[PDB]
């Protein structure tokens, strides 16, 4: 569907924390560090309600978006790994 609950992305050089909108039901993210010194968040979010790109891209200016692949499990782990991260994760909402 063009609309959906479960989304990841990342946000390259981020400038301040991520925060749980209200539209939000669950967020878990870190800091990873990329190449070239860039560095980005990692994240998975579950919307309260089904979301289009066009919304998720004015919930986080600036992320790239992608509709999830995988399992739930799978996207928490990715945004949770050991494998490159700086700081985190966080998770914020219920699942």
Excluded at 51 to 61: D, W
Aim: net charge positive; aromatic share 10%.
């Amino acid at each position: 569907a063009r609309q959906v609950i479960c989304w990841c992305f990342t946000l390259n050089n981020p400038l301040s924390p991520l925060s749980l909108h209200d539209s939000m039901k669950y967020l878990v993210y870190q800091t990873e560090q990329g190449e070239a010194g860039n560095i980005h968040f990692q994240g998975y979010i579950e919307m309260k309600k089904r979301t289009s790109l066009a919304g998720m891209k004015k919930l986080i200016p600036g992320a790239h978006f992608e509709k999830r692949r995988g399992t739930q499990g799978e996207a928490r782990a990715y945004s949770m790994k050991e494998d490159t991260r700086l700081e985190g994760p966080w998770e914020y909402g219920e699942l």
